[PDB]
Design a protein around this ligand. Structure first.
Ligand SMILES: *[C@@H]1O[C@H](CO)[C@@H](O[C@@H]2O[C@H](CO)[C@@H](O)[C@H](O)[C@H]2NC(C)=O)[C@H](O)[C@H]1NC(C)=O
Ligand SMILES: [Cl-]
Length: 184
């Protein structure tokens, strides 16, 4: 029996509180998934938080900047809540992120261009929010398999690079009135 990493545990508390997830080793239950890893110190095996999955829980909070302290995070799934305000730039510290699913919330603001640094992203579902600005951050997300930005306020055009993505099997940017497709 392993224990959860002390730092991940402390970060999880603040993240859940700010999301609105209401009430020691939370791994493997209630939306928290962990994986066995070598600890920074010691080298002994410890559990790290790798997935936060909180669909359909009537959450009304926000994504705390402390999300960036979960260095091993692979999945943040927050679909079908009432979460508000901006996607924090601190999520760029989650370099291993593969799944970012924020569909059907009320997230607002813009996505900064350096979101393209999340090179491992495979599933990016921002659909049905109130996000705005351009989609230049998609330029270098070459591993995307599932991409939806539908039903937002995005404008400009899809980056031409999307034409070269080889794994893209689901793509939706409908419901963005001032948004045009990728064109040369
Ligand atoms: C990614 O780019 C964004 C936008 O330029 C950066 O956001 C700024 O972050 C600093 C803290 O590092 C804040 O004080 C600023 O207010 C933010 N600006 C905006 C417009 O939100 C972000 O820091 C960049 N991150 C990385 C890793 O490059
Ligand atoms: Cl879920």
């Amino acid at each position: 029996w392993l224990d959860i990493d002390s730092s991940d545990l402390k970060a999880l508390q603040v993240i859940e509180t700010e999301l609105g997830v209401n009430s020691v080793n939370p791994c493997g239950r209630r939306g928290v998934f962990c994986e066995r890893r070598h600890s920074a110190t010691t080298g002994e095996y410890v559990l790290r938080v790798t997935r936060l999955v909180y669909r359909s829980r009537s959450l009304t909070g926000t994504i705390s900047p402390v999300i960036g302290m979960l260095s091993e995070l692979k999945e943040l799934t927050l679909s079908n809540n009432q979460l508000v305000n901006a996607v924090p730039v601190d999520i760029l510290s989650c370099k291993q992120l593969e799944v970012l699913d924020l569909r059907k919330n009320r997230f607002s603001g813009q996505i900064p261009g350096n979101f393209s640094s999340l090179s491992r992203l495979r599933i990016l579902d921002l659909s049905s929010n109130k996000l705005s600005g351009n989609l230049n951050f998609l330029k270098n997300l070459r591993n995307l398999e599932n991409l939806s930005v539908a039903n937002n306020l995005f404008s400009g055009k899809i980056p031409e690079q999307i034409v070269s993505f080889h794994n893209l099997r689901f793509f939706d940017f409908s419901g963005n009135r001032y948004l045009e497709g990728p064109a040369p």
